[PDB]
Amino acid sequence: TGFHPGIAFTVVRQDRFATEQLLYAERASESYFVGQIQVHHHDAIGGV
Amino acid sequence: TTQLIQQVSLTDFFRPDIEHAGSIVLILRHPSDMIGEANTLTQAGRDPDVLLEGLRNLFNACTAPWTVGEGGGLRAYVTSLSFIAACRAEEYTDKQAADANRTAIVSAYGCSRMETRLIRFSECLRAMVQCHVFPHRFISFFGSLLEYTIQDNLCNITAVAKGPQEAARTDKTSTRRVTANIPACVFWDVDKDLHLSADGLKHVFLVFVYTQRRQREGVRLHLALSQLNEQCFGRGIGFLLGRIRAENAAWGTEGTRALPLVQLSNDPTSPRCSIGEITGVNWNLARQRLYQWTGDFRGLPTQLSCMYAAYTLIGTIPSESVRYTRRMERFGGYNVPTIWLEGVVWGGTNTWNECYY
Amino acid sequence: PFEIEVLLPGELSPAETSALQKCEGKIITFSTLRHRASLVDIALSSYYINGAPPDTLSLLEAYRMRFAAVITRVIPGKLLAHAIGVGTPTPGLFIQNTSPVDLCNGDYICLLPPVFGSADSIRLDSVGLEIVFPLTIPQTLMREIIAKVVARAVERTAAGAQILPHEVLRGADVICYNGRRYELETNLQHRDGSDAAIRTLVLNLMFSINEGCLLLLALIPTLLVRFPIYETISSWISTSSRLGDTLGTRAILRVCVFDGPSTVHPGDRTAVIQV
Amino acid sequence: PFEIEVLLPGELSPAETSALQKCEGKIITFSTLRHRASLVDIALSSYYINGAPPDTLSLLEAYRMRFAAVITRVIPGKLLAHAIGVGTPTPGLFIQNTSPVDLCNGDYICLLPPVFGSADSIRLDSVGLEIVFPLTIPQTLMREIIAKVVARAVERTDVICYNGRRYELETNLQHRDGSDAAIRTLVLNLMFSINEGCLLLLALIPTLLVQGAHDGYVNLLIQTANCVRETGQLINIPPMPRIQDGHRRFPIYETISSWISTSSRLGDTLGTRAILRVCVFDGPSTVHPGDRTAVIQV
Amino acid sequence: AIASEALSLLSNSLRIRAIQQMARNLRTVLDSFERGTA
């Protein structure tokens, strides 16, 4: 009906936005070790 | 890696000439067993020979009608899935696809004694589900067609038994590989009705929905493709078929005081009947009343008169995120919508699970 | 591929070792799997329980717990076999029909003890043992066979129990397959196996069904218009589950015929595929 | 041979990695089968039904719905595992006995949640999840246990002897949305086991106990049963009606035939089905708890 | 049984200790037959 009772409210809402970021890195920041490769045969959907 | 099965048969229900390579082919049991089972399982009150009337006319409109009774090995053994799909096309939900396949199978075949054959088969199934002779024990399964050779009205076909679909060599087509092809009328995936993710491995089933009423019975044939478990498929199907289940529970059978056992056993001072009189000397005055119960239960829905479906595992698809393709191509002289399944491994024993709830 | 050898015994009489060659495509059953074995495990002597010869229940139960194997060829001093167990890729597997009912292509194979008539089997009196072979029929017929033989046995007790027999009937029970009527048990007399092996069978089956559709009638009295009451429920559930597990249906082989006759008659051999 | 890969989270503690390596032949489960997967589905958190750790009866249904897999050799980075449910060739499969009960050759294996004392399980504090492994007993143990938990279930709304040893079951039944479903599927099978034929078998009770005497087999069978041994001396059972079409129909056929399908279905819908068969080659006849046995796919 | 991500080493110091493993396993599997003889 529109009769305002003796009570108040506070609302909360959460949104999200896609943004563009920016990265900076030093010279000697990470050490990288790469390995070797291994093959695996397996029955595929039609072949291997 | 795969195995093959050969069999010769009459070509009145199957035509390996027009049927595409990779379609499903089923076989039938001897019709002489139907009557031996019907006259002993027919519900009380119903006429048991209406099936015989419906069956005799089937072979009366079929070539070599004087070759029934001996089973020498020259009967109409195998049949196609599209044949039953066209015979019962008036019951599938996809109106246009059903009737298109029907006219296509009528035209591509002899088209002279084909319409009569179809209606005979139609009421044949209708009378099959009239005396509880449900056609899920007489229709087996063969693999997809691989090779065939025919000279006239008699064909020798070979199909895969179990294993990968594209592991064979048809060796006479353009390519040496084939994929499963089905009419778009029978295809019905349940997960997209049940609203769950469709990723990973999925099983294949065939279902036989039954409707039982007075002079109005129906039987479809659906090839379901779902990721649901081996036995959980039964609980899943009931949620979608809850209507027909309740219809059958009330229109399946159309042809008395309780007793307080626990009450009078919990309380003492009831007429006792000690073993001394059941020894067997005068066992009538000892059991004169002891109770009456006036009890009998004759007409009640059995678990066989309320059945509405029967499924069976056929094969799986190991490749996750299947990509079945639907398109329309020429089938003889007409175009029909077919769905193409790739990489499906056949297997599984022929055991039928009946959903009576 | 795994294969089992059954060591043939010495001093075998010619008529005995000959008749062993007649049964080449017959299936046997092994308690434990091994490359070398004796004969007692194949004979019925290893099969009986509690000293007394086995009953159908022990027959059906042991068929599940015990493993199966098929004979392939016979050597005058050597007998080998092939297993249907783990993963053995047995090539050119063929079996012989031991049942009176024909088989066709695309039929699945399951096992049963001989119930219809007397069990035909080889008997070695020189050594003192005999070898019984299980009966094989399609799956779609098995459930109907068991239901009929028990119904035939309970109707016999009813006629004997009731003061007056309710004889009025339809004739004779006949099973049909591929347009062939078998017509088992013509006569009323000659109670060969009426209560000989299926004696305890009809007992457990009639009592569970009695307890079955009585427990419901004694729990909700509204279906038709001192006391535990729970231990009876747990007992019925345990029994009905075990009895259903015993009387199971599991296909073991599939008849896959290539360039051969589709229908096979009793006595003919045919190639089968491992399911 | 179809194998699924289980991604191990990084930064794992060596103590947890060692404890994880000890779990070599145990059974795990998957909600959706795929070659590459994570560890959140193996965790107990994925078992949550509403918002909380699941109940027993809820686990009974999760075991049927979910796929099953067996663990094989684990490397420091990955956890390989093979599937059992779908039809696939798998050579040399061994499982680790997790139940306190011994197994022997020719035994079917079932699957049930831990109803004994607090189940041992790997705990991952850094990852924050805990994986629990299901328990495996033979078939006969499965049926006896299931019958007792449902009996306790209908009681709300436990000792078990085996090989001369008694065990106690602690049934977790704090939930309610699953207990009523077991009652529904129970009566549904009892209702469909009632045909026009019971009256015949119900009219044999007098002669039954006569065969119970002076024969020496039906004694304990009458003893273990209660309803039949109380009805036999308390009800009259009006004699007999006739048959509608008795000239060509056999009425005691359906009741003995239809019941078979119910009993076979009852043992499965109430709990879990048989999944494996143990059969060891060049091994001991009986396996003790904690040892591994070579088993066959059912 | 060999080659669990290990055939990549034989089919191509780790190679040296891999052939060490090969030799140390073959020297045992060969005398396994000598033991089976007795």
Q: State the Cα–Cα distance between residues B213 and B130, nearest whole angstrom.
A: 9
- Of D75, D70, D79, D83, the closest CA to residue D1 belongs to D83
Cβ within 8 Å, pair B320-D2: no
- Give which of C142, C238, C249, C250 to mutate to test D binding, by max D Cβ within 10 Å: C238
**Residue in chain B lying closest to A43 (CA):** B164
- Of D1, A40, D81, the closest CA to residue E6 belongs to A40
DSSP string over C80-133: EEEE-SSS---TT-EEE--SSS-B-TT-EEEEE---SS----EEETTTTEEE--
Tell me the three state secondary structure of residue B230: coil
Q: State the Cα–Cα distance between residues C142 and A1, nearest whole angstrom.
A: 74
Query: Are C59 and C113 contacting, i.e. CB atoms less than 8 angstroms apart?
Result: yes
Q: Nearest-CA distance from C156 to chain B in Å?
A: 19
Cβ within 8 Å, pair D209-B279: no
Experimental method: cryo-EM
Neighbours of B, requiring at least 3 CB pairs below 8 Å, are A, C, D
Cβ within 8 Å, pair A36-E5: no
Give chain D positions within 8 Å (CB) of C66.
106
Q: Which of C106, C218, C249 sits opposite B5 (nearest CB)?
A: C106
| C218 vs B: CB within 8 A | yes
Cα torsion angle, B132, B138, B143, B149, sign:
negative
**Residue in chain A lying closest to B321 (CA):** A45
Q: State the Cα–Cα distance between residues D298 and D276, nearest whole angstrom.
A: 5
Q: Quick one: DSSP state of residue D45?
A: G
Dihedral (C-alpha) C107, C113, C118, C121: value to the nearest 10 degrees?
90
Which residue's entry shows tokens 């070539």? B63
Count of B-D CB contacts under 8 Å = 121
Q: Degrees (nearest 5) of the Cα angle A7, A13, A18?
A: 170
Cβ within 8 Å, pair B73-C262: yes
Residue C23 buriedness (CB in 10 A; 0-12 / 13-18 / 19+): middle
Contact C/B (≥3 CB pairs under 8 Å):
yes
Neighbours of D, requiring at least 3 CB pairs below 8 Å, are B, C
**Residue in chain B lying closest to A48 (CA):** B167
| B36 vs C: CB within 8 A | yes
- The span from the first CA to the last CA of chain A, in angstroms, equals 71
Query: Identity (one letter) of the amino acid at C44?
Result: L
Neighbours of C, requiring at least 3 CB pairs below 8 Å, are B, D
Count of A-E CB contacts under 8 Å = 5
Resolution (A): 3.7
Which residue's entry shows tokens 């009189």? B277
Neighbours of A, requiring at least 3 CB pairs below 8 Å, are B, E
Query: Can you list the positions of beta strands (E) in D107-254?
Result: 107-109, 121-123, 130-132, 159-162, 165-168
Q: Which of D246, D248, D263 sits opposite C244 (nearest CB)?
A: D263
Q: State the Cα–Cα distance between residues B105 and B17, nearest whole angstrom.
A: 12
Tell me the three state secondary structure of residue B58: helix
Cβ within 8 Å, pair B283-D206: yes
| CB interface of D with B, residues 70-99, below 8 Å | 85-87
Q: Nearest-CA distance from E27 to chain A in Å?
A: 28
Give chain B positions within 8 Å (CB) of D209.
275, 278
Strands C36-37 and C3-6: parallel
Give chain B positions within 8 Å (CB) of D67.
201
Give chain A positions within 8 Å (CB) of B177.
46
Q: Degrees (nearest 5) of the Cα angle E16, E20, E21?
A: 120
Instruction: Pull the structure tokens for residue A6.
Output: 């003796």
Query: Are C69 and C4 contacting, i.e. CB atoms less than 8 angstroms apart?
Result: yes
Query: Are C96 and C24 contacting, i.e. CB atoms less than 8 angstroms apart?
Result: yes
Which residue's entry shows tokens 């109940």? D55
Dihedral (C-alpha) D293, D294, E2, E8: value to the nearest 10 degrees?
-100
Cβ within 8 Å, pair D238-B295: yes
Q: What is the helix, strand, coil percentage profile of chain A, to 5?
A: 0, 0, 100
Q: State the Cα–Cα distance between residues C273 and C93, nearest whole angstrom.
A: 7
Q: Angle, nearest 10°, between helix axes C231-246 and D139-156?
A: 150
Cβ within 8 Å, pair B166-A46: yes
How many residues are present in chain D?
298
Which residue's entry shows tokens 């007429």? B271
| B258 vs D: CB within 8 A | no
Secondary structure of D247-282 in HEC code, one letter for each residue: CCCCHHHHHHHHHHHHHHHHHHHCCCCCCEEECCCC
Query: Identity (one letter) of the amino acid at A27?
Result: R
HSE of A6, CA atoms in CB hemisphere, 13 A: 0
**Residue in chain D lying closest to C65 (CA):** D106
Give chain A positions within 8 Å (CB) of E8.
36-39
Cβ within 8 Å, pair C168-D144: no
| C207 vs D: CB within 8 A | yes
Q: Which of D65, D250, D261 sits opposite B40 (nearest CB)?
A: D250
How many C-beta neighbours within 10 Å does residue B291 have? 20
| C168 vs D: CB within 8 A | yes
Q: State the Cα–Cα distance between residues B12 and A48, nearest whole angstrom.
A: 40
How many C-beta neighbours within 10 Å does residue D146 have? 23
Contact B/E (≥3 CB pairs under 8 Å):
no
Cβ within 8 Å, pair C235-D217: no
Q: Which of D191, D256, D296 sits opposite C147 (nearest CB)?
A: D256
- Give which of C173, C210, C229 to mutate to test D binding, by max D Cβ within 10 Å: C210
Q: Nearest-CA distance from A26 to chain E in Å?
A: 35
Q: Which of C207, C210, C216 sits opposite D190 (nearest CB)?
A: C216
